[PDB]
Design a protein around this ligand. Sequence first.
Ligand SMILES: Nc1ncnc2c1ncn2[C@@H]1O[C@H](CSCC[C@H](N)C(=O)O)[C@@H](O)[C@H]1O
Ligand SMILES: Nc1ncnc2c1ncn2[C@@H]1O[C@H](CSCC[C@H](N)C(=O)O)[C@@H](O)[C@H]1O
Lengths: 511, 511
Amino acid sequence: KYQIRYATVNDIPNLLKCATFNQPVNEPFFQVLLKQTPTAHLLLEYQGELVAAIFTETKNSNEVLGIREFLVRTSVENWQVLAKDLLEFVEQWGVVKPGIKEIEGLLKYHEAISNFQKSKWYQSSVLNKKLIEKITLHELATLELCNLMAPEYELEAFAARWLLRVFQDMGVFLREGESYQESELVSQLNISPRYQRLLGALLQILHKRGILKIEKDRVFTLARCKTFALENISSEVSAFYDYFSEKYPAHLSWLTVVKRCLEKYPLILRGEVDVNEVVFTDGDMELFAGLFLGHRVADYFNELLADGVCWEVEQRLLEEKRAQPIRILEIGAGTGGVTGILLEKLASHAEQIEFWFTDISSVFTRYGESKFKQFPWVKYQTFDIEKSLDAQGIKSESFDVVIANNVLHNTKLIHQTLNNSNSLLNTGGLLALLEFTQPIDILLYFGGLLQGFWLFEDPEYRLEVGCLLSIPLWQKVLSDCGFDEIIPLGLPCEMHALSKARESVIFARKH
Amino acid sequence: KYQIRYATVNDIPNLLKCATFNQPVNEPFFQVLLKQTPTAHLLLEYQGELVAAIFTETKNSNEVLGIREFLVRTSVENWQVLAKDLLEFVEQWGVVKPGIKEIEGLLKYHEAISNFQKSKWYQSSVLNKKLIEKITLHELATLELCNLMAPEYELEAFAARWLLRVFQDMGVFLREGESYQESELVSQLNISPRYQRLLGALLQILHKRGILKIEKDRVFTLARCKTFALENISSEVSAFYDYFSEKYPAHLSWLTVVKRCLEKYPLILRGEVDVNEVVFTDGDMELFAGLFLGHRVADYFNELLADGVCWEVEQRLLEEKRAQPIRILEIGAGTGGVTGILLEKLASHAEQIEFWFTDISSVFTRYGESKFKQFPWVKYQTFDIEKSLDAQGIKSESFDVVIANNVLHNTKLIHQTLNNSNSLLNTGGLLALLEFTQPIDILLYFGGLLQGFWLFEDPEYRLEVGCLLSIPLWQKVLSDCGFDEIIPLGLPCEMHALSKARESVIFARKH
Ligand SMILES: Nc1ncnc2c1ncn2[C@@H]1O[C@H](CSCC[C@H](N)C(=O)O)[C@@H](O)[C@H]1O
Ligand SMILES: Nc1ncnc2c1ncn2[C@@H]1O[C@H](CSCC[C@H](N)C(=O)O)[C@@H](O)[C@H]1O
């Protein structure tokens, strides 16, 4: 029923579609291995379809045989028994090859296929390969987190000292050894209903900085809370503002928003003042837009998101059926900050592409058309990712690229949101996300003030006590919702440590 | 057989000797609670000995009763059943007190005593309280790790790029996707026997930086190893030296030692050149001594070690039997860097104290007397902590303070070393340690070159693949070896996160 034969260079297109165990695929590298050792690499075919393939190498002065790569085609039905059959063939065929003594390390491959864990295995695509190269060679590849995230770190350290003083101004945490239950602080602080969960997240900020001990049933103030808070808000905030504005000017927006929030936090938390009157002063959306451009980490993720979608569009422009334009949709495009850098990128291909600038709020789609009315190929629509496509007049499975920049977490059930995102794309379409992926303090002070931050009803798939997902949780939920080829991206210095990354661009593909 | 009664201020001396569940004891605070509510605090006595005590508070507009502290005397035999009896008394006595509705949260105290975990519970002493205050108010309390450890971080980042190039110069890791087993690199790199385990630790450095994937059976080079290494050692090291020397001049010694090592690392690792000829150039011990003074983190830990021992000496000078002098011993005093700041501190009390400057090597005791011959009260002796006291002419249980600054890990079995340390002290004597407590890269490059780093035979009580112990492992082994009142100290900003601290002063007491 199936055939084992030598790989050839003619098999390279199909080998590039495989999941790989040791490293991402690489067209020019498969070429060189097949040119240098044309009878060292076996594949297994079943009805013309490629199922599994094994590349070997000879090592240790030519006496032991090693596996250099194990490729599998996971969408073939019984592939695990077939890949086991190819493994056992290679062992037999390898020990009797001229000169070999031993086959090195087959048990790891046997275990990998029988207990299959899709996230261990690399997958590849032109897109994956081009983004890794870009990250590897980026100007920021030489710097480390302490340099790159310094502004965020120092803002968050100061803001936490302010936040403890805000609690002390509302009557709690002046002394070490106070004992509360969380429900009792909600009452004693008179937190309005909408912000009771935000209070949990704010307590959690102080917990991670050693100010409070939060346990199953009780919040307990520790010794460090006697000395940690700011002592004079007005003069110390003024002094920090001067220091921070001059030293990290590109982060001025973050400092301004956090300043405007904390200054009025007791009244905001008690429900006595609205946040749109305090921080969204007089429809000053420009302040809020600058949170996400202008500084080198934010521009790095924007460049990563935008180049990825640009590359994917050119990949699909290389296809001869033509006909329908390539349709891109951006969910929650907002003030169109990252959108603007992408439209400039795609603008060369304006006649084959169709770009939908969308947001749940009519306010932001009209903001968008005010900024992009010169682009004939950008269309505007209100769209809510949590609401039915039909009711919103959108054909399912009609988009090639869906873009969502830090919006998808502001929903009730992340599995329903990604299903709906899946419904947007046709098979092979590309999901492109930019997400904060740690429960970062900086985001709570203002982002936690908005209602979308607290819709979530599936905490089992979120971090700590907020609405964010980590890289692993995103990988889990994206696979659960019918995406594969998931590519999580962080700063270059943490590509090996993304489970702790604050921010991440994630691409994924509908299968 | 036992009596439950109200605490009084006359019980405060004995209450200070208890383990506490919520926070460290505090003499002036017990005073104020007993003055304000003289009938709110119960204790349990058994044959005049204090066993357990409970301080309560009324909360929530005077309707619920809470436990403010639970004190226990763990050296009393059946104390856990006695403390349960006092808990159950307090519940009965509390619900019928005038005005109270409910007793808040007794189940946590019940669980704490029946499943006793000594390291949860605070313990106290004059020493503990004074060091917490010092840390809390220290000039460094306002800074965070990224500021304080910047020099170490940047040195370690550069040194790792150099180390990968050192491997590439010895023939491995030029390409992504190479597969080795650890035994096979030992052979292929021709590592001399003494440094085979150091090779493991060096591979581990690159593992944590994403250069290599180290698994049960194999070392696998990743993509990042194509671009990470220095490209021209001579010019890039020169450029870094200039940058680093001018920016962190107080760390010049660390950069010099790492430079001298890595420059000759292949020959050092192959056994072709000795490390004392390369880094200990011509008996230049001053270079090596400056590793541990001169910069603000190192001086902070020295100040913490020295003030702690100074305080403990003055505590014991407040005792009227007098007679024998207070005898201090420093294990592995080395070049006496921290010793010099301590002798200046103790020099006021020179006539009641007797200080033993000791080291395993006669070279370092003579170095010591060259530096401290002006102090009549300092005695010199070669001493090996791993060797028998009797054979070395030292009375057991004769010392009041034993000091060991980053030496105790350089031994074969940490439990035998702490037992021997225990044998030095009389009951109530003080162990004072300064230890690196993460498997830090910086220390491997040169410290890993010395044989004492590799004596250890109990990896189950060490970190990763070196000889260090973390804070929790130190707490475990110190308790296993007969010490209590264990006080782990780190930088002020991490007193709540010491399981990740790079360096720690630890005091402990012989019971
Ligand atoms: N359920 C939902 N469906 C579609 N858009 C949503 C949404 N919930 C919130 N949004 C929109 O997403 C944004 C929240 S985060 C804004 C990020 C945006 N990319 C920007 O650059 O501004 C808001 O503008 C909001 O209008
Ligand atoms: N088993 C042992 N017993 C006593 N001293 C030891 C020892 N092993 C090593 N030493 C000594 O401890 C030192 C190793 S670390 C040196 C730290 C020392 N406090 C200083 O400031 O220099 C060396 O000087 C060595 O001579």
